[PDB]
Coordinates of C-alpha atoms and ligand atoms in Angstrom, one line a residue:
Chain E
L10 CA -5.0 -79.1 32.8
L11 CA -8.0 -81.2 32.0
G12 CA -10.6 -83.1 33.5
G13 CA -12.8 -82.3 36.4
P14 CA -13.1 -83.1 40.3
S15 CA -14.8 -85.9 42.1
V16 CA -16.1 -86.4 44.7
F17 CA -16.1 -88.8 47.6
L18 CA -18.2 -89.4 50.6
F19 CA -17.3 -91.6 53.6
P20 CA -19.6 -93.2 56.4
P21 CA -18.5 -93.3 60.0
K22 CA -16.8 -95.8 61.1
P23 CA -19.1 -98.6 62.7
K24 CA -18.1 -98.2 66.2
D25 CA -18.1 -94.7 66.7
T26 CA -22.2 -94.9 65.6
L27 CA -22.4 -97.6 68.6
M28 CA -20.8 -95.7 71.5
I29 CA -22.4 -92.9 72.8
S30 CA -18.6 -91.3 74.1
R31 CA -17.2 -91.7 70.2
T32 CA -18.0 -89.3 67.8
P33 CA -19.1 -90.4 64.4
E34 CA -18.4 -88.2 61.3
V35 CA -19.3 -88.5 57.9
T36 CA -16.8 -87.2 55.5
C37 CA -17.2 -85.2 52.3
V38 CA -13.7 -85.4 50.0
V39 CA -13.2 -83.4 46.8
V40 CA -10.5 -84.2 44.7
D41 CA -9.0 -83.3 41.2
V42 CA -9.8 -79.7 42.0
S43 CA -8.8 -76.8 39.5
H44 CA -5.1 -75.8 40.7
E45 CA -6.2 -72.1 39.5
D46 CA -9.5 -72.1 41.0
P47 CA -9.8 -73.7 44.2
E48 CA -12.4 -72.0 46.0
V49 CA -14.9 -74.8 46.7
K50 CA -18.4 -74.4 48.7
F51 CA -20.1 -77.5 50.7
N52 CA -23.7 -77.4 51.2
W53 CA -24.9 -80.9 53.7
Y54 CA -28.2 -81.6 54.1
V55 CA -29.8 -84.4 56.7
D56 CA -33.1 -85.7 55.0
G57 CA -33.0 -82.9 52.7
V58 CA -32.8 -80.6 55.3
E59 CA -30.3 -78.3 55.2
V60 CA -26.8 -78.3 57.5
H61 CA -24.6 -75.6 58.8
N62 CA -22.3 -77.3 61.4
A63 CA -19.8 -79.3 59.1
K64 CA -16.2 -78.2 59.7
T65 CA -14.3 -78.0 56.5
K66 CA -10.5 -78.1 56.5
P67 CA -7.7 -75.9 54.9
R68 CA -7.4 -76.8 51.1
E69 CA -4.5 -79.2 50.5
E70 CA -2.4 -78.3 47.2
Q71 CA -1.6 -82.0 45.7
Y72 CA 2.0 -82.6 43.7
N73 CA -0.2 -83.5 40.8
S74 CA -0.7 -79.9 40.7
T75 CA -4.3 -80.2 42.0
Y76 CA -6.2 -79.1 45.5
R77 CA -7.9 -81.9 47.8
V78 CA -10.7 -80.2 49.5
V79 CA -12.7 -82.3 53.0
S80 CA -15.3 -81.2 55.0
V81 CA -16.3 -83.1 58.2
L82 CA -19.7 -83.4 59.0
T83 CA -20.0 -84.7 62.8
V84 CA -23.6 -86.8 63.1
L85 CA -25.5 -87.7 65.8
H86 CA -25.7 -91.4 66.7
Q87 CA -29.1 -91.9 66.8
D88 CA -29.6 -90.5 63.2
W89 CA -27.4 -92.4 61.5
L90 CA -28.8 -95.3 62.9
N91 CA -32.3 -94.0 62.7
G92 CA -31.3 -94.3 58.6
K93 CA -31.1 -90.1 57.7
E94 CA -29.6 -89.4 54.5
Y95 CA -26.6 -87.0 54.7
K96 CA -26.0 -85.6 51.4
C97 CA -22.8 -83.5 50.6
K98 CA -23.3 -80.6 47.6
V99 CA -19.7 -79.5 46.3
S100 CA -19.7 -76.4 44.0
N101 CA -16.9 -74.9 42.3
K102 CA -16.6 -72.2 39.7
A103 CA -15.0 -74.7 37.3
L104 CA -17.9 -77.0 37.5
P105 CA -21.0 -76.7 34.8
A106 CA -22.9 -78.0 38.0
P107 CA -22.4 -78.8 42.0
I108 CA -21.8 -82.6 42.2
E109 CA -24.3 -84.1 44.6
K110 CA -23.4 -87.4 46.7
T111 CA -25.6 -89.2 49.2
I112 CA -24.6 -91.8 52.1
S113 CA -27.0 -93.6 54.5
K114 CA -27.0 -96.7 56.2
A115 CA -28.3 -99.7 54.0
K116 CA -31.6 -100.1 54.0
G117 CA -33.2 -102.6 55.8
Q118 CA -34.5 -104.6 59.0
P119 CA -31.7 -105.0 61.1
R120 CA -30.5 -108.7 62.5
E121 CA -29.1 -109.6 65.3
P122 CA -25.6 -111.1 65.0
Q123 CA -25.1 -114.7 66.1
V124 CA -21.5 -115.1 67.5
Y125 CA -20.0 -118.7 67.8
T126 CA -16.1 -119.4 69.0
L127 CA -14.3 -122.5 67.3
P128 CA -11.5 -124.2 68.4
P129 CA -8.4 -124.8 66.9
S130 CA -8.8 -128.0 64.3
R131 CA -7.1 -131.2 65.6
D132 CA -4.5 -131.0 62.9
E133 CA -3.7 -127.6 64.0
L134 CA -1.9 -128.8 67.4
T135 CA 1.1 -130.2 65.4
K136 CA 2.2 -126.2 64.6
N137 CA 3.5 -123.9 66.8
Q138 CA 0.3 -121.3 66.5
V139 CA -3.3 -122.4 66.6
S140 CA -6.3 -120.2 65.0
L141 CA -8.9 -119.7 67.4
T142 CA -12.0 -118.5 65.1
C143 CA -15.2 -116.5 65.9
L144 CA -18.2 -116.8 63.4
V145 CA -20.0 -113.6 63.6
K146 CA -23.7 -114.8 61.5
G147 CA -26.8 -113.8 60.8
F148 CA -26.6 -110.0 60.7
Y149 CA -27.5 -106.6 59.3
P150 CA -26.3 -104.3 58.4
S151 CA -23.1 -105.1 57.2
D152 CA -21.5 -102.8 59.8
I153 CA -20.0 -104.3 62.6
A154 CA -16.8 -104.2 64.7
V155 CA -15.0 -107.8 66.2
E156 CA -12.2 -107.7 68.2
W157 CA -10.4 -110.2 70.5
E158 CA -8.9 -109.8 73.8
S159 CA -8.1 -112.1 77.0
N160 CA -7.6 -110.9 80.4
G161 CA -9.0 -107.7 79.7
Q162 CA -6.4 -106.5 77.0
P163 CA -6.8 -106.5 73.6
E164 CA -5.0 -109.7 71.5
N165 CA -2.4 -108.5 68.7
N166 CA -2.5 -111.0 66.1
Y167 CA -6.1 -111.4 64.6
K168 CA -7.6 -110.8 61.2
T169 CA -10.8 -110.2 60.4
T170 CA -12.6 -110.9 56.6
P171 CA -14.8 -108.4 55.4
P172 CA -18.6 -109.3 55.6
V173 CA -20.3 -111.8 52.9
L174 CA -23.6 -111.7 51.7
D175 CA -25.4 -115.2 52.8
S176 CA -28.0 -116.8 50.9
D177 CA -31.3 -115.3 53.4
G178 CA -29.3 -111.7 52.4
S179 CA -28.0 -111.5 56.2
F180 CA -24.1 -110.8 56.2
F181 CA -21.5 -112.9 57.9
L182 CA -17.6 -112.9 58.3
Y183 CA -15.2 -114.9 60.4
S184 CA -12.1 -113.3 62.7
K185 CA -9.3 -115.3 63.0
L186 CA -6.9 -114.7 66.0
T187 CA -3.9 -116.3 65.8
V188 CA -1.9 -117.1 69.3
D189 CA 1.2 -119.5 70.6
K190 CA -0.2 -122.9 71.2
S191 CA 1.4 -123.1 74.6
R192 CA -1.2 -120.3 75.9
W193 CA -3.9 -122.1 74.2
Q194 CA -3.0 -125.8 75.9
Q195 CA -2.4 -123.5 79.2
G196 CA -6.0 -123.1 79.3
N197 CA -6.2 -119.2 79.1
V198 CA -9.5 -117.8 78.2
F199 CA -9.7 -115.7 74.6
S200 CA -13.4 -113.5 74.0
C201 CA -14.3 -112.5 70.7
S202 CA -16.1 -108.8 71.1
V203 CA -18.9 -107.9 68.6
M204 CA -20.4 -104.4 68.6
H205 CA -23.4 -104.4 65.8
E206 CA -26.7 -102.0 66.4
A207 CA -28.8 -105.5 66.8
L208 CA -27.0 -106.6 70.0
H209 CA -28.5 -105.1 73.3
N210 CA -26.0 -102.6 74.7
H211 CA -24.5 -103.0 71.0
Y212 CA -22.1 -105.8 72.8
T213 CA -21.7 -109.0 73.1
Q214 CA -18.8 -111.6 74.1
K215 CA -18.2 -114.9 73.8
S216 CA -15.3 -116.7 75.3
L217 CA -13.4 -120.0 74.5
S218 CA -10.8 -122.2 75.7
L219 CA -9.4 -125.5 76.0
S220 CA -11.5 -128.5 77.7
Chain A
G13 CA -14.3 -93.5 29.0
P14 CA -13.6 -95.6 26.5
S15 CA -12.1 -97.6 30.0
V16 CA -10.2 -100.6 30.1
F17 CA -10.2 -103.4 32.4
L18 CA -8.1 -106.7 32.2
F19 CA -9.3 -109.8 34.6
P20 CA -7.2 -112.7 35.0
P21 CA -8.5 -116.3 34.4
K22 CA -10.5 -117.8 37.0
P23 CA -8.4 -120.3 39.6
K24 CA -9.8 -123.7 38.7
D25 CA -9.1 -123.5 34.8
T26 CA -5.4 -122.6 35.1
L27 CA -4.2 -125.5 37.5
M28 CA -6.6 -127.9 35.4
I29 CA -5.2 -129.1 31.9
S30 CA -8.4 -130.0 30.2
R31 CA -10.0 -126.6 31.5
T32 CA -9.6 -123.2 29.3
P33 CA -7.8 -120.6 31.2
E34 CA -8.2 -117.3 29.6
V35 CA -7.7 -113.3 30.4
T36 CA -10.2 -111.1 29.3
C37 CA -10.1 -107.2 28.2
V38 CA -13.2 -105.7 29.0
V39 CA -13.5 -101.8 27.5
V40 CA -16.7 -100.1 28.3
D41 CA -18.4 -96.6 27.6
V42 CA -17.3 -97.4 23.8
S43 CA -19.2 -94.5 22.1
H44 CA -22.7 -95.1 20.2
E45 CA -21.5 -93.8 17.4
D46 CA -17.6 -95.4 16.9
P47 CA -18.1 -99.0 18.3
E48 CA -15.0 -100.4 16.2
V49 CA -12.4 -101.0 18.7
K50 CA -9.2 -103.1 18.3
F51 CA -7.2 -105.3 20.6
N52 CA -3.7 -106.0 20.1
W53 CA -2.1 -108.7 22.9
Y54 CA 1.4 -109.2 23.9
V55 CA 2.8 -112.1 26.2
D56 CA 5.9 -111.2 27.8
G57 CA 6.2 -108.0 25.6
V58 CA 5.9 -110.5 22.6
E59 CA 2.9 -110.5 20.4
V60 CA 0.3 -113.2 19.9
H61 CA -2.8 -113.5 18.0
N62 CA -5.4 -116.3 19.4
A63 CA -7.5 -113.4 21.0
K64 CA -11.5 -113.9 20.0
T65 CA -13.6 -110.7 20.1
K66 CA -16.9 -111.0 21.3
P67 CA -20.0 -109.5 19.4
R68 CA -20.3 -105.5 20.1
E69 CA -22.6 -105.1 23.1
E70 CA -25.2 -102.0 23.7
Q71 CA -25.7 -100.8 27.1
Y72 CA -28.8 -98.4 29.0
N73 CA -26.7 -95.5 29.3
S74 CA -26.6 -94.9 25.8
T75 CA -23.0 -97.1 25.6
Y76 CA -21.4 -100.0 24.0
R77 CA -19.3 -102.6 25.8
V78 CA -16.6 -104.5 23.8
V79 CA -15.4 -107.6 25.1
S80 CA -12.1 -109.6 23.8
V81 CA -10.9 -112.7 25.7
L82 CA -7.4 -114.2 25.4
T83 CA -6.7 -117.9 25.8
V84 CA -3.3 -118.6 27.8
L85 CA -1.0 -121.3 28.5
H86 CA -1.7 -123.1 32.1
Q87 CA 2.0 -122.8 32.7
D88 CA 2.6 -119.6 30.9
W89 CA 0.4 -117.7 33.9
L90 CA 1.8 -120.2 36.7
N91 CA 5.1 -119.1 35.2
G92 CA 4.1 -115.3 35.7
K93 CA 4.1 -114.6 32.3
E94 CA 2.6 -110.8 31.9
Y95 CA -0.6 -110.6 29.4
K96 CA -1.0 -107.1 27.7
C97 CA -4.1 -105.5 25.9
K98 CA -3.8 -102.8 24.2
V99 CA -6.9 -101.1 23.1
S100 CA -7.1 -98.4 20.5
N101 CA -10.2 -95.8 19.0
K102 CA -10.3 -92.1 17.9
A103 CA -12.4 -91.7 21.2
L104 CA -9.1 -91.6 22.7
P105 CA -6.0 -89.5 21.5
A106 CA -3.4 -92.5 22.0
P107 CA -3.7 -96.1 22.6
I108 CA -4.6 -98.1 26.1
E109 CA -2.4 -100.4 27.7
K110 CA -3.4 -102.6 30.5
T111 CA -1.4 -105.5 31.9
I112 CA -1.7 -108.1 34.4
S113 CA -0.1 -110.9 35.7
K114 CA 0.1 -113.4 38.8
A115 CA 1.0 -112.4 41.9
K116 CA 4.6 -113.0 42.1
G117 CA 6.5 -114.8 44.7
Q118 CA 7.2 -118.3 46.1
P119 CA 3.8 -120.1 46.0
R120 CA 2.7 -121.8 49.3
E121 CA 0.6 -124.9 49.9
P122 CA -2.7 -124.1 51.8
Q123 CA -3.3 -125.5 55.3
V124 CA -7.2 -127.0 55.4
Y125 CA -8.8 -127.2 58.6
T126 CA -12.6 -128.5 58.9
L127 CA -13.8 -127.3 62.3
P128 CA -17.0 -128.1 63.3
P129 CA -20.3 -126.2 64.7
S130 CA -20.1 -124.5 67.8
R131 CA -21.8 -126.4 70.7
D132 CA -24.1 -123.1 71.2
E133 CA -25.3 -123.7 67.7
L134 CA -26.8 -127.0 68.3
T135 CA -30.1 -125.4 69.0
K136 CA -31.3 -124.2 65.3
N137 CA -32.6 -125.9 62.2
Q138 CA -29.2 -125.4 60.9
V139 CA -25.5 -125.6 61.6
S140 CA -22.5 -124.5 60.3
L141 CA -19.8 -126.4 58.6
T142 CA -16.6 -124.3 58.7
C143 CA -13.4 -124.7 56.3
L144 CA -10.4 -123.0 56.9
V145 CA -7.8 -122.4 54.8
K146 CA -4.7 -120.5 55.8
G147 CA -0.9 -119.6 54.8
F148 CA -1.5 -119.5 51.1
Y149 CA 0.1 -117.6 48.6
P150 CA -0.8 -116.4 45.8
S151 CA -4.3 -115.6 46.5
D152 CA -5.7 -117.4 43.8
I153 CA -7.8 -120.7 44.7
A154 CA -11.0 -122.5 44.8
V155 CA -12.9 -124.0 47.4
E156 CA -15.8 -126.0 47.3
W157 CA -17.7 -128.7 49.4
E158 CA -19.0 -132.1 48.6
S159 CA -20.6 -135.0 50.7
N160 CA -20.9 -138.4 48.9
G161 CA -19.1 -137.2 45.8
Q162 CA -22.2 -134.8 45.4
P163 CA -21.5 -131.3 45.6
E164 CA -23.6 -129.5 48.2
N165 CA -25.0 -126.1 47.1
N166 CA -25.5 -124.2 50.4
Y167 CA -22.4 -122.6 51.3
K168 CA -20.5 -119.1 50.9
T169 CA -16.9 -118.5 50.9
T170 CA -14.9 -115.4 52.0
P171 CA -12.6 -113.6 49.7
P172 CA -8.8 -114.2 50.5
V173 CA -7.5 -112.1 53.2
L174 CA -3.9 -110.6 53.6
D175 CA -2.9 -111.9 56.8
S176 CA 0.2 -111.2 59.0
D177 CA 3.0 -112.9 57.3
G178 CA 1.7 -111.9 54.0
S179 CA 0.1 -115.1 53.7
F180 CA -3.7 -115.3 52.9
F181 CA -6.1 -117.1 54.6
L182 CA -10.5 -117.5 53.7
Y183 CA -13.1 -119.4 55.4
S184 CA -15.5 -121.3 53.8
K185 CA -19.2 -121.9 55.3
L186 CA -21.4 -124.8 54.4
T187 CA -24.9 -124.9 56.0
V188 CA -26.8 -128.1 56.2
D189 CA -30.0 -129.4 58.1
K190 CA -29.0 -130.2 61.5
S191 CA -30.6 -133.9 60.9
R192 CA -27.9 -134.4 58.4
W193 CA -25.0 -133.2 60.9
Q194 CA -26.2 -135.3 63.7
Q195 CA -27.0 -138.8 61.2
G196 CA -23.1 -138.9 60.7
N197 CA -22.9 -137.6 57.1
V198 CA -19.4 -137.0 56.4
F199 CA -18.9 -133.6 54.6
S200 CA -15.6 -132.7 52.9
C201 CA -14.2 -129.2 52.1
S202 CA -11.8 -129.4 48.6
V203 CA -9.5 -126.9 48.1
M204 CA -7.3 -126.1 44.7
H205 CA -4.3 -124.1 44.5
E206 CA -0.7 -124.3 42.4
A207 CA 1.0 -125.2 45.6
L208 CA -0.6 -128.3 46.7
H209 CA 0.3 -131.8 45.2
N210 CA -1.4 -132.5 41.9
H211 CA -3.4 -129.1 42.9
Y212 CA -5.8 -130.0 44.7
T213 CA -6.5 -131.5 48.1
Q214 CA -9.9 -132.3 50.5
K215 CA -10.2 -132.6 54.2
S216 CA -13.1 -134.2 55.9
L217 CA -15.8 -133.7 58.6
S218 CA -18.2 -135.7 60.5
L219 CA -19.7 -136.1 63.9
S220 CA -16.6 -136.8 66.0
Ligands
LIG1 C1 -22.7 -97.4 31.7 O1 -22.9 -98.5 31.8 C2 -21.9 -99.8 32.3 C3 -22.4 -101.1 32.8 O2 -23.9 -100.7 33.5 C4 -21.0 -99.3 32.8 O3 -20.0 -99.7 33.1 C5 -19.3 -100.3 34.2 O4 -18.3 -99.2 34.4 C6 -17.4 -99.3 35.6 C7 -16.2 -98.1 35.7 O5 -16.8 -96.5 35.7 C8 -16.4 -100.7 35.7 O6 -16.5 -100.6 37.2 C9 -14.9 -101.4 37.6 O7 -15.1 -102.7 37.4 C10 -14.4 -103.8 37.8 C11 -15.0 -105.0 38.2 O8 -15.6 -105.7 37.0 C12 -16.5 -106.7 37.2 O9 -17.5 -106.7 38.3 C13 -18.2 -106.2 38.3 C14 -19.7 -106.1 39.5 O10 -19.1 -106.9 40.3 C15 -19.1 -106.6 37.2 O11 -20.2 -105.7 36.4 C16 -18.2 -106.6 35.7 O12 -18.6 -106.8 33.9 C17 -17.0 -107.5 36.5 O13 -17.7 -108.7 36.3 C18 -16.6 -110.0 36.1 O14 -16.0 -109.8 35.3 C19 -14.6 -110.7 34.5 C20 -14.4 -110.9 33.6 O15 -15.4 -110.2 32.6 C21 -15.0 -112.0 35.2 O16 -14.0 -113.0 34.7 C22 -15.2 -112.2 36.9 O17 -15.7 -113.2 37.1 C23 -16.3 -111.2 36.8 N1 -16.4 -110.7 38.4 C24 -17.2 -110.9 39.3 C25 -17.5 -112.6 39.4 O18 -18.4 -110.5 39.3 C26 -13.9 -103.4 39.2 O19 -12.4 -103.8 39.7 C27 -13.2 -101.6 38.6 O20 -12.8 -101.3 40.0 C28 -11.2 -100.9 39.7 O21 -11.4 -99.7 38.5 C29 -11.6 -99.0 39.2 C30 -11.7 -97.6 38.2 O22 -12.4 -97.0 37.9 C31 -10.8 -98.1 40.4 O23 -11.8 -97.6 41.6 C32 -11.0 -99.7 41.5 O24 -9.8 -99.3 42.6 C33 -10.4 -101.1 40.9 O25 -9.0 -100.2 40.3 C34 -8.3 -101.8 40.4 O26 -8.2 -101.9 41.6 C35 -8.1 -103.3 42.4 C36 -7.8 -103.3 43.7 O27 -6.7 -103.1 44.8 C37 -6.4 -103.4 41.4 O28 -6.2 -104.4 41.7 C38 -6.4 -103.1 40.2 O29 -4.6 -103.1 40.0 C39 -6.8 -101.4 39.9 N2 -6.7 -100.8 38.8 C40 -6.7 -99.7 38.3 C41 -6.0 -98.6 39.0 O30 -7.3 -99.0 37.5 C42 -14.7 -100.8 38.7 O31 -15.7 -101.2 39.4 C43 -17.9 -101.8 35.9 O32 -17.5 -103.2 35.8 C44 -18.9 -101.6 34.4 N3 -19.6 -102.2 34.7 C45 -19.6 -103.5 33.7 C46 -21.0 -104.3 33.1 O33 -18.8 -104.1 33.2 C47 -20.4 -97.7 32.6 O34 -19.7 -96.7 33.6 C48 -22.0 -96.5 32.8 N4 -21.7 -95.6 32.1 C49 -21.2 -94.8 33.1 C50 -19.8 -94.5 33.9 O35 -21.9 -93.5 32.7
LIG2 C1 -4.0 -86.0 42.6 O1 -3.3 -86.6 43.4 C2 -4.7 -87.1 44.6 C3 -4.3 -87.4 45.6 O2 -2.9 -88.7 45.4 C4 -5.4 -87.8 43.9 O3 -6.6 -88.2 44.5 C5 -7.0 -89.3 44.7 O4 -8.0 -89.8 43.8 C6 -8.8 -91.1 43.1 C7 -9.8 -90.8 42.6 O5 -9.3 -91.1 41.0 C8 -9.2 -91.3 44.7 O6 -9.7 -93.0 44.8 C9 -10.8 -92.8 45.8 O7 -10.3 -93.9 46.9 C10 -11.3 -94.4 47.8 C11 -11.2 -94.3 48.8 O8 -10.4 -93.3 49.8 C12 -9.8 -93.3 51.0 O9 -8.3 -94.7 50.9 C13 -7.6 -93.9 49.9 C14 -6.4 -95.0 50.3 O10 -7.0 -96.4 50.7 C15 -7.1 -93.0 51.2 O11 -5.7 -92.3 50.8 C16 -8.3 -91.5 51.4 O12 -7.2 -90.8 51.9 C17 -9.4 -92.5 51.8 O13 -9.3 -92.7 52.8 C18 -10.5 -92.8 53.8 O14 -10.2 -91.1 54.0 C19 -11.9 -90.9 54.8 C20 -12.3 -89.4 54.9 O15 -10.9 -88.9 55.2 C21 -12.0 -92.0 56.4 O16 -13.0 -91.8 57.2 C22 -11.5 -93.5 55.7 O17 -11.4 -94.5 56.6 C23 -10.5 -93.9 55.1 N1 -10.0 -95.0 54.6 C24 -8.2 -95.1 54.5 C25 -8.1 -96.2 54.3 O18 -7.7 -94.5 54.7 C26 -12.4 -95.2 46.8 O19 -13.5 -95.2 47.5 C27 -13.1 -94.3 45.9 O20 -13.6 -95.5 45.5 C28 -15.2 -95.6 44.9 O21 -15.0 -94.7 43.2 C29 -14.4 -95.0 42.5 C30 -14.3 -94.2 41.4 O22 -13.3 -93.7 41.3 C31 -15.0 -96.8 42.2 O23 -14.0 -97.4 41.2 C32 -15.1 -97.6 43.6 O24 -15.8 -98.6 43.0 C33 -15.6 -96.6 44.5 O25 -17.0 -96.6 44.2 C34 -11.8 -94.2 45.0 O26 -11.2 -95.2 44.8 C35 -8.1 -91.1 46.3 O27 -9.2 -91.4 47.4 C36 -7.8 -89.9 46.0 N2 -6.9 -89.6 47.1 C37 -6.4 -88.7 48.6 C38 -5.3 -89.2 48.9 O28 -7.7 -88.2 48.7 C39 -5.7 -87.7 42.3 O29 -6.5 -89.0 41.4 C40 -4.5 -87.2 41.2 N3 -4.8 -86.4 40.0 C41 -4.2 -87.1 39.1 C42 -5.2 -86.1 38.2 O30 -3.5 -87.7 39.2

């Protein structure tokens, strides 16, 4: 059947690179591997230097009669943050040439996010739920983790915008936590948690409660 | 390719009768050799003719790029008509059909909340004025800022985000000089959406 494999290379999750105890991975995924010749070879390189510790998963047969193969390379936190490049080379006999993809952290000088919490608009207080907002602005690169909590337990009902390119070339985002107004008006404290490589200890919190 | 990408009207254009909303059929990867593509255009299956195929354009990767733009009735698009592009060539065995329409479902009125700058932000030369727009459906929307019926230029708006009830929200951030905020200038966030009365509403923001 007619057409060739495709390769997708996926970065570590932002929170994985930023905590020593978690385990950051770069994932190389090959799809549309021939049903007939499904042998694939992965070579990995860190800054053009070949490495041998990835773990390639057994091939998965798909219902559209192709295979999908995935190799996971576990990376050192410091490496990814120090901007190394991760190259996946995929070879297969049905392929006139190997397919190479590279991924690294975005280029540029990191910048520290500014975290501001904003209470509910006056007008929202007629409603039974209100929006507590966290503005995180001025950061670089865009790889960031945002979450909300109260009383040491995370909150269940928030949404976070993707990062947006600002005019000075830094990124911003907003996270919206929705809570029942009684909780806001009872005076409970909510906190917006931000992890970004350019924070001290890779972490910062801002709290928000009614006067 | 040749690949075909079909694109909806900008939101502002379908909500105002004097503007011209159009769906656009973009074909990329047209050979260097055979840049004769034809476009066929159906509205809810029925062939229409007012499409206008732009001049055949060339690209860096030895490749051509061809665009047909079809004008649509405001009310057709808002009524959920389906717009189909059929793109024909030798380059491919059989013709390629793309269709788009408005997202389906009961439109819902955006709620619009202006929030002033965080007290912590008042240490900077510039402060962020925030417009929260939530609760709206479909995701098609336009947001602008003004002060003294003049457009303000220094704003960025997030894309729509799918919220927990299946409505969308977004935030728009306007950046102004601090002094402008403290002198008590009124700033206003304006929103255009199908589900608003007259398709538009504004909300204002000043020092208290
Ligand atoms: C040779 O060089 C050529 C030019 O350099 C190059 O052409 C490029 O080809 C690729 C495909 O290989 C094409 O990529 C797609 O682009 C879509 C976006 O088009 C936008 O955005 C980009 C940049 O931001 C612009 O360059 C585009 O021209 C275009 O501008 C928009 O244009 C419209 C109308 O003209 C305006 O009205 C808009 O204002 C304007 N946008 C703005 C403001 O910037 C993009 O959506 C495509 O994604 C979809 O298709 C992919 C398939 O390849 C899927 O992976 C992906 O998921 C998307 O699929 C869709 O997913 C959506 C999300 O859920 C769904 O809603 C859809 O249903 C779903 N459809 C599916 C399944 O297909 C994709 O990125 C580039 O745009 C094109 N560049 C140009 C100039 O057009 C050639 O590739 C080069 N040849 C090669 C390969 O060697
Ligand atoms: C036979 O069946 C196959 C399986 O159904 C089909 O395979 C599919 O092939 C298409 C390519 O045509 C791939 O499309 C790519 O998807 C990328 C996103 O992949 C993530 O998200 C999807 C759904 O959200 C998910 O199923 C994937 O598993 C993958 O998940 C992530 O996985 C990594 C690694 O495990 C993890 O660390 C991430 O968190 C996790 N994310 C999630 C949400 O789970 C896109 O990135 C790709 O986009 C790039 O390339 C485009 C060009 O194709 C381009 O337009 C974009 O702009 C961008 O650069 C791309 O869209 C599917 O991933 C693949 N699916 C699977 C299951 O692996 C196959 O197509 C079909 N064959 C035929 C002939 O029909």
